XYZ file of N, CA, C and O in Angstrom:
860
model
N -25.234 -29.962 -86.223
C -24.682 -29.750 -84.851
C -24.160 -31.061 -84.280
O -24.591 -32.140 -84.693
N -23.221 -30.990 -83.320
C -22.674 -32.209 -82.723
C -23.774 -33.131 -82.214
O -24.926 -32.718 -82.068
N -23.408 -34.384 -81.955
C -24.337 -35.379 -81.434
C -24.428 -35.169 -79.926
O -25.457 -35.430 -79.307
N -23.334 -34.685 -79.345
C -23.263 -34.444 -77.911
C -22.498 -33.166 -77.582
O -21.579 -32.776 -78.301
N -22.887 -32.522 -76.485
C -22.244 -31.295 -76.032
C -22.322 -31.204 -74.513
O -23.333 -31.562 -73.907
N -21.252 -30.721 -73.899
C -21.215 -30.586 -72.454
C -20.200 -29.500 -72.100
O -18.993 -29.755 -72.068
N -20.697 -28.292 -71.837
C -19.831 -27.161 -71.508
C -19.077 -27.290 -70.194
O -18.188 -26.492 -69.910
N -19.424 -28.288 -69.387
C -18.725 -28.487 -68.123
C -17.304 -28.933 -68.465
O -16.353 -28.649 -67.738
N -17.175 -29.614 -69.600
C -15.891 -30.107 -70.080
C -14.910 -28.977 -70.357
O -13.700 -29.148 -70.210
N -15.431 -27.821 -70.763
C -14.575 -26.685 -71.086
C -14.484 -25.603 -70.020
O -13.887 -24.558 -70.253
N -15.073 -25.855 -68.855
C -15.021 -24.895 -67.762
C -15.996 -23.727 -67.791
O -15.689 -22.648 -67.279
N -17.167 -23.931 -68.379
C -18.177 -22.878 -68.463
C -19.117 -22.863 -67.258
O -19.774 -21.855 -66.982
N -19.166 -23.979 -66.535
C -20.082 -24.130 -65.410
C -19.487 -24.187 -64.008
O -18.473 -24.841 -63.774
N -20.143 -23.501 -63.073
C -19.722 -23.476 -61.673
C -20.460 -24.611 -60.962
O -21.405 -25.175 -61.509
N -20.033 -24.970 -59.741
C -20.701 -26.052 -59.010
C -22.193 -25.787 -58.830
O -22.642 -24.646 -58.926
N -22.950 -26.845 -58.568
C -24.379 -26.716 -58.336
C -24.610 -25.853 -57.092
O -23.883 -25.957 -56.104
N -25.623 -24.999 -57.147
C -25.951 -24.135 -56.022
C -27.319 -24.527 -55.463
O -27.997 -25.395 -56.020
N -27.720 -23.889 -54.366
C -28.997 -24.179 -53.733
C -29.744 -22.908 -53.344
O -29.320 -22.179 -52.451
N -30.874 -22.670 -53.996
C -31.680 -21.486 -53.746
C -32.459 -21.544 -52.439
O -32.946 -20.526 -51.954
N -32.594 -22.733 -51.871
C -33.329 -22.848 -50.625
C -34.793 -22.461 -50.760
O -35.333 -22.385 -51.868
N -35.439 -22.209 -49.625
C -36.854 -21.851 -49.598
C -37.076 -20.410 -50.010
O -37.480 -19.576 -49.203
N -36.812 -20.132 -51.281
C -36.959 -18.797 -51.847
C -37.128 -18.953 -53.353
O -36.340 -19.635 -54.005
N -38.168 -18.332 -53.897
C -38.424 -18.444 -55.325
C -37.488 -17.622 -56.185
O -37.944 -16.797 -56.974
N -36.181 -17.861 -56.050
C -35.180 -17.122 -56.811
C -34.510 -17.929 -57.920
O -33.436 -17.554 -58.398
N -35.144 -19.026 -58.328
C -34.609 -19.885 -59.386
C -34.244 -19.104 -60.650
O -33.323 -19.483 -61.373
N -34.958 -18.015 -60.913
C -34.689 -17.194 -62.090
C -33.330 -16.518 -61.965
O -32.673 -16.231 -62.968
N -32.919 -16.259 -60.728
C -31.632 -15.628 -60.465
C -30.484 -16.620 -60.666
O -29.429 -16.265 -61.196
N -30.691 -17.863 -60.248
C -29.656 -18.879 -60.399
C -29.485 -19.311 -61.855
O -28.391 -19.682 -62.283
N -30.572 -19.248 -62.614
C -30.535 -19.601 -64.022
C -29.771 -18.507 -64.768
O -28.936 -18.790 -65.623
N -30.063 -17.255 -64.422
C -29.428 -16.100 -65.053
C -27.937 -16.035 -64.772
O -27.138 -15.816 -65.684
N -27.561 -16.215 -63.512
C -26.153 -16.172 -63.150
C -25.416 -17.279 -63.889
O -24.309 -17.074 -64.384
N -26.039 -18.452 -63.964
C -25.425 -19.569 -64.658
C -25.113 -19.224 -66.100
O -24.034 -19.539 -66.605
N -26.060 -18.579 -66.773
C -25.870 -18.187 -68.163
C -24.776 -17.122 -68.247
O -23.914 -17.172 -69.127
N -24.816 -16.163 -67.325
C -23.830 -15.095 -67.289
C -22.432 -15.635 -67.003
O -21.467 -15.268 -67.677
N -22.324 -16.504 -66.002
C -21.037 -17.093 -65.649
C -20.446 -17.799 -66.872
O -19.231 -17.805 -67.067
N -21.316 -18.364 -67.706
C -20.859 -19.053 -68.899
C -20.446 -18.105 -70.013
O -19.455 -18.337 -70.708
N -21.201 -17.028 -70.190
C -20.874 -16.072 -71.229
C -19.684 -15.200 -70.856
O -18.935 -14.777 -71.737
N -19.503 -14.925 -69.564
C -18.354 -14.134 -69.138
C -17.118 -15.012 -69.343
O -16.063 -14.535 -69.762
N -17.255 -16.303 -69.057
C -16.134 -17.224 -69.220
C -15.700 -17.298 -70.682
O -14.508 -17.233 -70.986
N -16.668 -17.442 -71.583
C -16.363 -17.521 -73.007
C -15.563 -16.297 -73.446
O -14.647 -16.406 -74.256
N -15.902 -15.139 -72.890
C -15.234 -13.892 -73.238
C -13.881 -13.639 -72.578
O -12.931 -13.235 -73.242
N -13.796 -13.876 -71.276
C -12.571 -13.612 -70.525
C -11.724 -14.832 -70.171
O -10.560 -14.695 -69.796
N -12.306 -16.019 -70.268
C -11.561 -17.214 -69.927
C -11.466 -17.386 -68.423
O -10.718 -18.237 -67.937
N -12.221 -16.574 -67.683
C -12.232 -16.643 -66.223
C -13.623 -16.958 -65.674
O -14.592 -16.262 -65.977
N -13.709 -18.003 -64.857
C -14.974 -18.421 -64.266
C -15.165 -17.862 -62.851
O -14.499 -18.290 -61.908
N -16.077 -16.902 -62.715
C -16.374 -16.291 -61.420
C -17.849 -16.491 -61.062
O -18.746 -16.191 -61.853
N -18.093 -17.012 -59.867
C -19.451 -17.236 -59.405
C -20.085 -15.859 -59.194
O -19.494 -14.999 -58.535
N -21.278 -15.651 -59.756
C -21.973 -14.362 -59.642
C -23.040 -14.344 -58.547
O -23.636 -15.369 -58.232
N -23.291 -13.165 -57.986
C -24.261 -13.014 -56.902
C -25.736 -13.094 -57.270
O -26.240 -12.236 -57.999
N -26.427 -14.112 -56.755
C -27.855 -14.254 -57.012
C -28.581 -13.262 -56.109
O -29.610 -12.693 -56.489
N -28.032 -13.058 -54.916
C -28.614 -12.142 -53.947
C -28.685 -10.732 -54.533
O -29.662 -10.010 -54.312
N -27.643 -10.344 -55.269
C -27.581 -9.030 -55.909
C -28.804 -8.895 -56.817
O -29.461 -7.850 -56.849
N -29.119 -9.969 -57.540
C -30.267 -9.967 -58.443
C -31.585 -9.919 -57.664
O -32.503 -9.173 -58.016
N -31.663 -10.704 -56.596
C -32.849 -10.760 -55.757
C -33.220 -9.417 -55.129
O -34.399 -9.041 -55.112
N -32.222 -8.698 -54.611
C -32.476 -7.414 -53.960
C -32.568 -6.193 -54.867
O -33.200 -5.201 -54.498
N -31.947 -6.250 -56.042
C -31.914 -5.073 -56.904
C -32.673 -5.054 -58.223
O -32.827 -3.986 -58.821
N -33.150 -6.199 -58.693
C -33.825 -6.206 -59.984
C -35.328 -5.974 -59.953
O -36.043 -6.337 -60.897
N -35.803 -5.354 -58.874
C -37.220 -5.058 -58.763
C -37.673 -4.117 -59.869
O -38.745 -4.311 -60.435
N -36.881 -3.082 -60.204
C -37.290 -2.160 -61.269
C -37.451 -2.824 -62.639
O -38.241 -2.363 -63.462
N -36.703 -3.894 -62.895
C -36.804 -4.576 -64.185
C -38.025 -5.487 -64.254
O -38.354 -6.021 -65.314
N -38.691 -5.674 -63.121
C -39.870 -6.517 -63.101
C -39.773 -7.752 -62.225
O -40.744 -8.484 -62.091
N -38.610 -8.000 -61.633
C -38.471 -9.163 -60.773
C -39.114 -8.917 -59.408
O -39.336 -7.772 -59.024
N -39.414 -9.999 -58.689
C -40.073 -9.916 -57.392
C -39.359 -10.683 -56.271
O -40.005 -11.368 -55.471
N -38.038 -10.566 -56.205
C -37.296 -11.259 -55.165
C -37.612 -12.744 -55.068
O -37.592 -13.458 -56.073
N -37.916 -13.205 -53.856
C -38.218 -14.620 -53.617
C -39.611 -15.052 -54.078
O -40.004 -16.206 -53.902
N -40.358 -14.133 -54.671
C -41.699 -14.455 -55.142
C -41.735 -14.745 -56.640
O -42.772 -15.131 -57.176
N -40.611 -14.555 -57.320
C -40.587 -14.846 -58.742
C -39.899 -13.819 -59.607
O -39.632 -12.702 -59.157
N -39.624 -14.202 -60.854
C -38.963 -13.314 -61.793
C -38.690 -14.003 -63.116
O -39.164 -15.115 -63.337
N -37.941 -13.338 -63.998
C -37.588 -13.880 -65.310
C -36.093 -13.727 -65.520
O -35.492 -12.777 -65.022
N -35.488 -14.653 -66.257
C -34.051 -14.578 -66.517
C -33.723 -13.344 -67.358
O -32.688 -12.701 -67.163
N -34.609 -13.016 -68.293
C -34.398 -11.853 -69.140
C -34.406 -10.551 -68.336
O -33.688 -9.606 -68.680
N -35.204 -10.502 -67.267
C -35.261 -9.305 -66.430
C -33.923 -9.167 -65.706
O -33.424 -8.062 -65.506
N -33.338 -10.301 -65.330
C -32.061 -10.292 -64.637
C -30.977 -9.762 -65.567
O -30.134 -8.971 -65.162
N -31.007 -10.195 -66.823
C -30.020 -9.741 -67.793
C -30.183 -8.242 -68.019
O -29.204 -7.494 -68.079
N -31.434 -7.811 -68.148
C -31.751 -6.404 -68.361
C -31.210 -5.583 -67.191
O -30.709 -4.461 -67.369
N -31.314 -6.142 -65.990
C -30.804 -5.459 -64.813
C -29.296 -5.268 -64.938
O -28.802 -4.144 -64.860
N -28.566 -6.365 -65.132
C -27.118 -6.279 -65.257
C -26.747 -5.196 -66.259
O -25.789 -4.457 -66.059
N -27.526 -5.098 -67.331
C -27.279 -4.097 -68.358
C -27.596 -2.685 -67.855
O -26.753 -1.797 -67.934
N -28.802 -2.476 -67.331
C -29.182 -1.153 -66.817
C -28.354 -0.720 -65.610
O -28.076 0.460 -65.438
N -27.982 -1.683 -64.770
C -27.206 -1.417 -63.566
C -25.754 -1.063 -63.872
O -25.121 -0.289 -63.146
N -25.224 -1.642 -64.943
C -23.849 -1.371 -65.311
C -22.889 -2.330 -64.642
O -21.686 -2.067 -64.568
N -23.418 -3.442 -64.148
C -22.573 -4.421 -63.500
C -23.326 -5.406 -62.629
O -24.553 -5.336 -62.493
N -22.579 -6.341 -62.049
C -23.135 -7.355 -61.160
C -22.016 -7.839 -60.238
O -20.937 -8.186 -60.696
N -22.272 -7.854 -58.939
C -21.259 -8.284 -57.981
C -21.035 -9.795 -57.961
O -21.896 -10.584 -58.379
N -19.871 -10.187 -57.457
C -19.505 -11.594 -57.365
C -20.230 -12.292 -56.218
O -20.673 -11.654 -55.262
N -20.341 -13.613 -56.329
C -20.985 -14.445 -55.317
C -20.317 -14.257 -53.947
O -20.991 -14.211 -52.917
N -18.993 -14.142 -53.950
C -18.223 -13.968 -52.722
C -18.437 -12.604 -52.058
O -18.472 -12.503 -50.830
N -18.585 -11.556 -52.862
C -18.785 -10.211 -52.316
C -20.225 -9.947 -51.863
O -20.462 -9.185 -50.929
N -21.184 -10.586 -52.523
C -22.595 -10.393 -52.204
C -23.236 -11.772 -51.999
O -23.996 -12.237 -52.843
N -22.936 -12.431 -50.865
C -23.422 -13.761 -50.459
C -24.936 -13.989 -50.522
O -25.728 -13.082 -50.280
N -25.329 -15.221 -50.826
C -26.738 -15.578 -50.919
C -27.378 -15.741 -49.538
O -26.849 -16.454 -48.685
N -28.520 -15.089 -49.324
C -29.207 -15.162 -48.039
C -30.582 -15.836 -48.091
O -31.252 -15.975 -47.061
N -31.000 -16.249 -49.286
C -32.286 -16.917 -49.473
C -33.481 -16.083 -49.019
O -34.555 -16.624 -48.772
N -33.295 -14.772 -48.902
C -34.375 -13.883 -48.495
C -34.090 -12.498 -49.055
O -32.932 -12.102 -49.157
N -35.140 -11.764 -49.421
C -34.957 -10.435 -50.002
C -34.635 -9.350 -48.982
O -35.331 -9.190 -47.974
N -33.574 -8.603 -49.277
C -33.098 -7.514 -48.430
C -32.923 -6.284 -49.320
O -33.026 -6.374 -50.538
N -32.654 -5.136 -48.714
C -32.458 -3.918 -49.487
C -31.247 -4.103 -50.391
O -30.298 -4.806 -50.040
N -31.285 -3.475 -51.558
C -30.193 -3.576 -52.515
C -28.890 -2.989 -51.965
O -28.861 -1.849 -51.499
N -27.816 -3.774 -52.022
C -26.515 -3.335 -51.521
C -25.439 -3.444 -52.591
O -24.269 -3.644 -52.283
N -25.844 -3.315 -53.848
C -24.907 -3.399 -54.949
C -23.776 -2.391 -54.777
O -24.010 -1.226 -54.463
N -22.551 -2.857 -54.981
C -21.364 -2.017 -54.876
C -20.554 -2.230 -56.154
O -19.957 -3.288 -56.347
N -20.521 -1.221 -57.039
C -19.779 -1.332 -58.297
C -18.316 -1.718 -58.139
O -17.685 -2.153 -59.099
N -17.781 -1.568 -56.930
C -16.380 -1.908 -56.669
C -16.155 -3.414 -56.745
O -15.038 -3.874 -56.981
N -17.221 -4.181 -56.553
C -17.123 -5.633 -56.591
C -17.788 -6.269 -57.809
O -17.953 -7.490 -57.867
N -18.160 -5.445 -58.785
C -18.792 -5.949 -59.997
C -17.771 -6.761 -60.782
O -16.619 -6.354 -60.917
N -18.191 -7.908 -61.303
C -17.279 -8.752 -62.061
C -17.896 -9.254 -63.356
O -17.283 -10.040 -64.071
N -19.104 -8.798 -63.659
C -19.776 -9.233 -64.876
C -20.638 -8.134 -65.477
O -20.930 -7.136 -64.824
N -21.040 -8.322 -66.728
C -21.884 -7.344 -67.403
C -22.407 -7.899 -68.724
O -21.917 -8.914 -69.219
N -23.425 -7.257 -69.281
C -23.953 -7.684 -70.566
C -24.544 -6.496 -71.302
O -24.902 -5.489 -70.692
N -24.611 -6.611 -72.623
C -25.147 -5.553 -73.460
C -26.440 -6.045 -74.108
O -26.715 -5.770 -75.272
N -27.233 -6.781 -73.343
C -28.482 -7.287 -73.870
C -28.630 -8.791 -73.731
O -27.919 -9.432 -72.947
N -29.560 -9.353 -74.496
C -29.814 -10.785 -74.478
C -30.535 -11.234 -75.743
O -31.119 -10.423 -76.456
N -30.493 -12.533 -76.011
C -31.137 -13.090 -77.189
C -32.143 -14.153 -76.778
O -31.807 -15.059 -76.009
N -33.375 -14.043 -77.267
C -34.387 -15.054 -76.975
C -34.444 -16.003 -78.166
O -34.736 -15.589 -79.284
N -34.156 -17.277 -77.921
C -34.150 -18.282 -78.978
C -35.551 -18.691 -79.421
O -36.481 -18.742 -78.615
N -35.719 -18.978 -80.722
C -37.020 -19.392 -81.259
C -37.493 -20.653 -80.528
O -36.692 -21.545 -80.228
N -38.793 -20.725 -80.259
C -39.380 -21.850 -79.535
C -39.418 -23.217 -80.233
O -40.483 -23.796 -80.449
N -38.241 -23.723 -80.578
C -38.100 -25.035 -81.199
C -36.864 -25.693 -80.602
O -35.840 -25.041 -80.393
N -36.963 -26.984 -80.326
C -35.843 -27.706 -79.754
C -34.654 -27.695 -80.704
O -33.503 -27.736 -80.268
N -34.934 -27.617 -82.001
C -33.875 -27.608 -83.002
C -33.050 -26.332 -82.865
O -31.826 -26.362 -82.989
N -33.720 -25.216 -82.597
C -33.031 -23.936 -82.434
C -32.292 -23.907 -81.098
O -31.225 -23.306 -80.980
N -32.862 -24.559 -80.090
C -32.219 -24.604 -78.784
C -30.932 -25.418 -78.892
O -29.928 -25.119 -78.238
N -30.965 -26.443 -79.737
C -29.800 -27.294 -79.941
C -28.654 -26.512 -80.565
O -27.519 -26.582 -80.101
N -28.949 -25.756 -81.614
C -27.912 -24.966 -82.269
C -27.328 -23.952 -81.293
O -26.115 -23.774 -81.232
N -28.200 -23.302 -80.527
C -27.777 -22.303 -79.555
C -26.846 -22.908 -78.508
O -25.794 -22.339 -78.187
N -27.230 -24.065 -77.982
C -26.423 -24.738 -76.975
C -25.050 -25.093 -77.529
O -24.046 -25.034 -76.819
N -25.006 -25.457 -78.804
C -23.745 -25.832 -79.430
C -22.841 -24.658 -79.802
O -21.624 -24.803 -79.846
N -23.419 -23.490 -80.055
C -22.598 -22.354 -80.465
C -22.442 -21.219 -79.463
O -21.546 -20.394 -79.610
N -23.298 -21.169 -78.447
C -23.207 -20.100 -77.458
C -22.621 -20.541 -76.126
O -21.751 -19.865 -75.565
N -23.092 -21.679 -75.627
C -22.639 -22.171 -74.339
C -23.879 -22.419 -73.501
O -24.962 -22.577 -74.066
N -23.774 -22.453 -72.163
C -24.947 -22.692 -71.315
C -26.109 -21.761 -71.642
O -25.908 -20.566 -71.838
N -27.321 -22.307 -71.696
C -28.503 -21.503 -72.012
C -29.543 -21.508 -70.886
O -29.811 -22.547 -70.280
N -30.135 -20.348 -70.612
C -31.176 -20.262 -69.589
C -32.494 -20.728 -70.212
O -32.822 -20.343 -71.334
N -33.226 -21.574 -69.493
C -34.508 -22.103 -69.975
C -35.473 -22.317 -68.813
O -35.053 -22.472 -67.665
N -36.764 -22.327 -69.123
C -37.795 -22.543 -68.117
C -38.419 -23.909 -68.356
O -38.668 -24.302 -69.490
N -38.692 -24.623 -67.275
C -39.251 -25.962 -67.366
C -40.519 -26.102 -66.541
O -40.736 -25.349 -65.592
N -41.364 -27.050 -66.926
C -42.577 -27.338 -66.181
C -42.132 -28.393 -65.185
O -41.995 -29.563 -65.529
N -41.871 -27.963 -63.960
C -41.427 -28.866 -62.906
C -42.577 -29.052 -61.940
O -42.380 -29.418 -60.780
N -43.782 -28.796 -62.434
C -44.961 -28.913 -61.605
C -45.429 -30.318 -61.275
O -46.634 -30.558 -61.257
N -44.505 -31.241 -61.000
C -44.886 -32.615 -60.673
C -44.024 -33.306 -59.625
O -42.835 -33.021 -59.490
N -44.653 -34.217 -58.886
C -43.986 -34.991 -57.847
C -42.734 -35.644 -58.421
O -41.688 -35.696 -57.771
N -42.878 -36.160 -59.641
C -41.812 -36.863 -60.342
C -40.550 -36.045 -60.516
O -39.447 -36.566 -60.348
N -40.698 -34.769 -60.861
C -39.520 -33.941 -61.045
C -38.818 -33.795 -59.718
O -37.593 -33.888 -59.618
N -39.625 -33.549 -58.700
C -39.140 -33.347 -57.355
C -38.469 -34.568 -56.728
O -37.525 -34.428 -55.942
N -38.960 -35.762 -57.056
C -38.385 -36.990 -56.509
C -37.337 -37.582 -57.445
O -36.788 -38.648 -57.173
N -37.070 -36.890 -58.548
C -36.090 -37.341 -59.527
C -34.741 -37.727 -58.903
O -34.198 -37.004 -58.065
N -34.210 -38.869 -59.326
C -32.926 -39.366 -58.832
C -31.924 -39.613 -59.965
O -30.800 -39.115 -59.922
N -32.335 -40.377 -60.976
C -31.452 -40.681 -62.098
C -32.178 -41.008 -63.403
O -33.395 -41.223 -63.419
N -31.421 -41.031 -64.498
C -31.992 -41.351 -65.798
C -32.582 -40.186 -66.573
O -32.413 -39.026 -66.197
N -33.263 -40.497 -67.673
C -33.899 -39.470 -68.492
C -35.291 -39.182 -67.939
O -36.151 -40.059 -67.899
N -35.510 -37.943 -67.520
C -36.786 -37.539 -66.963
C -37.841 -37.331 -68.043
O -37.622 -36.602 -69.012
N -38.985 -37.978 -67.867
C -40.092 -37.852 -68.802
C -41.402 -37.893 -68.028
O -41.810 -38.947 -67.531
N -42.061 -36.746 -67.932
C -43.327 -36.659 -67.223
C -44.500 -36.676 -68.199
O -44.794 -35.672 -68.848
N -45.192 -37.819 -68.304
C -46.338 -37.971 -69.208
C -47.302 -36.799 -69.112
O -47.970 -36.446 -70.078
N -47.355 -36.190 -67.934
C -48.262 -35.081 -67.696
C -47.602 -33.701 -67.814
O -48.169 -32.706 -67.370
N -46.419 -33.628 -68.420
C -45.755 -32.335 -68.552
C -46.446 -31.446 -69.567
O -47.077 -31.921 -70.514
N -46.325 -30.146 -69.352
C -46.914 -29.160 -70.239
C -45.797 -28.351 -70.885
O -44.789 -28.045 -70.248
N -45.962 -28.024 -72.159
C -44.961 -27.227 -72.852
C -45.472 -25.792 -72.895
O -45.024 -24.988 -73.710
N -46.399 -25.482 -71.992
C -47.010 -24.162 -71.930
C -46.910 -23.475 -70.565
O -46.729 -22.261 -70.496
N -47.032 -24.240 -69.484
C -46.985 -23.658 -68.144
C -45.688 -23.904 -67.369
O -45.720 -24.411 -66.246
N -44.549 -23.537 -67.953
C -43.272 -23.730 -67.265
C -43.291 -22.893 -65.991
O -43.807 -21.774 -65.988
N -42.728 -23.427 -64.912
C -42.708 -22.703 -63.645
C -41.344 -22.727 -62.938
O -41.196 -22.195 -61.836
N -40.347 -23.323 -63.581
C -39.020 -23.416 -62.988
C -37.902 -23.071 -63.971
O -37.769 -23.694 -65.024
N -37.098 -22.074 -63.618
C -35.999 -21.671 -64.475
C -34.755 -22.470 -64.147
O -34.372 -22.560 -62.988
N -34.127 -23.058 -65.163
C -32.920 -23.859 -64.977
C -31.865 -23.541 -66.037
O -31.993 -22.563 -66.767
N -30.834 -24.374 -66.130
C -29.756 -24.150 -67.090
C -29.397 -25.387 -67.919
O -29.175 -26.472 -67.383
N -29.346 -25.211 -69.236
C -28.977 -26.286 -70.147
C -27.470 -26.162 -70.374
O -27.006 -25.171 -70.940
N -26.707 -27.152 -69.926
C -25.257 -27.106 -70.097
C -24.770 -27.934 -71.281
O -23.603 -27.860 -71.664
N -25.669 -28.720 -71.861
C -25.305 -29.549 -72.996
C -26.434 -30.477 -73.391
O -27.595 -30.229 -73.064
N -26.094 -31.551 -74.093
C -27.083 -32.527 -74.536
C -26.386 -33.732 -75.151
O -25.230 -33.644 -75.571
N -27.095 -34.852 -75.214
C -26.512 -36.050 -75.779
C -27.512 -37.174 -75.919
O -28.720 -36.945 -75.912
N -27.000 -38.395 -76.038
C -27.846 -39.573 -76.203
C -27.267 -40.769 -75.450
O -26.071 -40.818 -75.167
N -28.122 -41.734 -75.134
C -27.673 -42.926 -74.433
C -27.752 -44.142 -75.345
O -28.476 -44.142 -76.343
N -26.998 -45.178 -74.992
C -26.966 -46.413 -75.767
C -27.667 -47.553 -75.032
O -28.378 -47.330 -74.051
N -34.020 -41.719 -76.372
C -32.699 -41.929 -75.792
C -31.883 -40.630 -75.751
O -30.738 -40.623 -75.302
N -32.474 -39.540 -76.235
C -31.797 -38.248 -76.245
C -32.210 -37.441 -75.025
O -33.311 -37.608 -74.496
N -31.330 -36.552 -74.583
C -31.628 -35.747 -73.412
C -30.876 -34.424 -73.375
O -29.849 -34.259 -74.031
N -31.412 -33.487 -72.597
C -30.793 -32.190 -72.399
C -30.111 -32.331 -71.044
O -30.705 -32.860 -70.109
N -28.861 -31.894 -70.939
C -28.145 -31.965 -69.674
C -28.548 -30.693 -68.950
O -28.208 -29.593 -69.383
N -29.270 -30.833 -67.847
C -29.743 -29.669 -67.123
C -29.204 -29.494 -65.719
O -29.222 -30.418 -64.904
N -28.726 -28.286 -65.444
C -28.205 -27.955 -64.132
C -29.344 -27.278 -63.381
O -29.932 -26.310 -63.868
N -29.658 -27.804 -62.205
C -30.721 -27.260 -61.370
C -30.067 -26.416 -60.286
O -28.842 -26.320 -60.225
N -30.883 -25.812 -59.433
C -30.391 -24.980 -58.344
C -31.018 -25.426 -57.028
O -31.417 -24.600 -56.207
N -31.100 -26.743 -56.845
C -31.684 -27.339 -55.650
C -30.660 -28.127 -54.840
O -31.022 -29.042 -54.103
N -29.388 -27.769 -54.976
C -28.346 -28.473 -54.251
C -27.985 -29.768 -54.950
O -28.715 -30.221 -55.823
N -26.865 -30.371 -54.571
C -26.442 -31.617 -55.201
C -27.025 -32.890 -54.590
O -26.638 -33.991 -54.971
N -27.959 -32.749 -53.657
C -28.570 -33.918 -53.041
C -29.884 -34.262 -53.744
O -30.614 -35.161 -53.327
N -30.170 -33.532 -54.819
C -31.368 -33.751 -55.622
C -30.924 -34.259 -56.991
O -29.924 -33.784 -57.534
N -31.668 -35.212 -57.546
C -31.322 -35.768 -58.851
C -29.904 -36.314 -58.939
O -29.399 -36.909 -57.987
N -29.252 -36.105 -60.076
C -27.885 -36.584 -60.265
C -26.867 -35.522 -59.856
O -26.315 -34.825 -60.711
N -26.615 -35.404 -58.555
C -25.663 -34.417 -58.071
C -26.078 -32.993 -58.405
O -25.239 -32.099 -58.557
N -27.383 -32.774 -58.516
C -27.879 -31.458 -58.850
C -28.251 -31.341 -60.316
O -28.810 -30.327 -60.739
N -27.945 -32.373 -61.099
C -28.264 -32.365 -62.523
C -29.415 -33.292 -62.895
O -29.776 -34.198 -62.149
N -29.997 -33.049 -64.061
C -31.086 -33.876 -64.555
C -30.992 -33.955 -66.066
O -30.613 -32.987 -66.737
N -31.310 -35.131 -66.595
C -31.302 -35.351 -68.032
C -32.750 -35.324 -68.525
O -33.466 -36.324 -68.440
N -33.169 -34.158 -69.018
C -34.523 -33.939 -69.530
C -34.700 -34.545 -70.923
O -33.803 -34.470 -71.753
N -35.866 -35.133 -71.175
C -36.152 -35.759 -72.462
C -36.003 -34.787 -73.625
O -36.655 -33.742 -73.658
N -35.152 -35.134 -74.583
C -34.928 -34.270 -75.742
C -35.563 -34.806 -77.022
O -35.574 -36.010 -77.270
N -36.091 -33.892 -77.829
C -36.741 -34.240 -79.089
C -37.989 -35.098 -78.893
O -38.254 -36.009 -79.668
N -38.745 -34.800 -77.844
C -39.982 -35.514 -77.547
C -41.117 -34.493 -77.567
O -41.921 -34.432 -76.636
N -41.165 -33.684 -78.625
C -42.191 -32.657 -78.765
C -42.064 -31.569 -77.692
O -43.037 -31.220 -77.027
N -40.855 -31.042 -77.527
C -40.596 -29.993 -76.550
C -41.120 -30.374 -75.169
O -41.923 -29.656 -74.573
N -40.645 -31.505 -74.662
C -41.070 -32.000 -73.361
C -40.896 -30.963 -72.260
O -39.825 -30.386 -72.102
N -41.966 -30.742 -71.504
C -41.978 -29.787 -70.406
C -41.606 -28.375 -70.864
O -41.374 -27.483 -70.044
N -41.538 -28.188 -72.179
C -41.219 -26.890 -72.745
C -39.826 -26.326 -72.523
O -39.693 -25.118 -72.310
N -38.795 -27.172 -72.579
C -37.415 -26.713 -72.388
C -37.059 -25.595 -73.364
O -36.297 -24.692 -73.024
N -37.611 -25.650 -74.574
C -37.297 -24.646 -75.589
C -38.325 -23.531 -75.768
O -38.235 -22.740 -76.715
N -39.293 -23.454 -74.862
C -40.329 -22.434 -74.952
C -39.882 -21.044 -74.486
O -40.359 -20.034 -74.997
N -38.978 -20.987 -73.517
C -38.492 -19.704 -73.017
C -36.989 -19.760 -72.798
O -36.507 -19.541 -71.690
N -36.253 -20.057 -73.860
C -34.805 -20.159 -73.778
C -34.131 -18.860 -74.197
O -34.543 -18.212 -75.159
N -33.089 -18.483 -73.473
C -32.373 -17.261 -73.797
C -31.000 -17.238 -73.143
O -30.685 -18.079 -72.297
N -30.182 -16.276 -73.556
C -28.840 -16.116 -73.016
C -28.452 -14.653 -73.131
O -29.036 -13.909 -73.922
N -27.471 -14.212 -72.331
C -27.041 -12.813 -72.383
C -25.853 -12.595 -73.323
O -25.052 -13.506 -73.541
N -25.756 -11.393 -73.887
C -24.639 -11.053 -74.758
C -23.738 -10.153 -73.926
O -24.112 -9.036 -73.593
N -22.562 -10.652 -73.568
C -21.627 -9.894 -72.742
C -20.494 -9.282 -73.559
O -19.724 -8.474 -72.985
């Protein structure tokens, strides 16, 4: 696989978003993966509605602002038969009744693939599929106060991930890292991005729960 990869270069990624005071990170991770897979297929980048996921994916197992899984979001898009655009179904940072309107659906998927729990497999996936949804252990002050450089939390766990994010690529400095897009606005870390330690024994478990949708 390449030494470096960055799907932002090819137009697979939308600007950094902000979930606010709502545990909907799983929705932003899912939309990010979907926006990337829809782009690969149609060549068109459309921001997808996280709110649509927050209000309607309860049957798949999600819990609005209290938590969820990226795979449940993909399953929803599949069972629902569509997903509305970010512009048609604006983010409200709070759970409301489902208002999905198929007239504004702009994305879809026929399932999803869960990558094997190895950084080596995550690397191949990132290089051949595009942006990948992953869960990270962000359970530390350090992640939260992150500003720049390669993030490495001596106390990270590769078992208790609690934050869903997006891997847009990977590379090395002149030392390896995963290029990660967060959903905490661009005033956090590097304009909303973070370079997670790569090939350091699955640091914070980036490759423990990685997956993407098949559109």
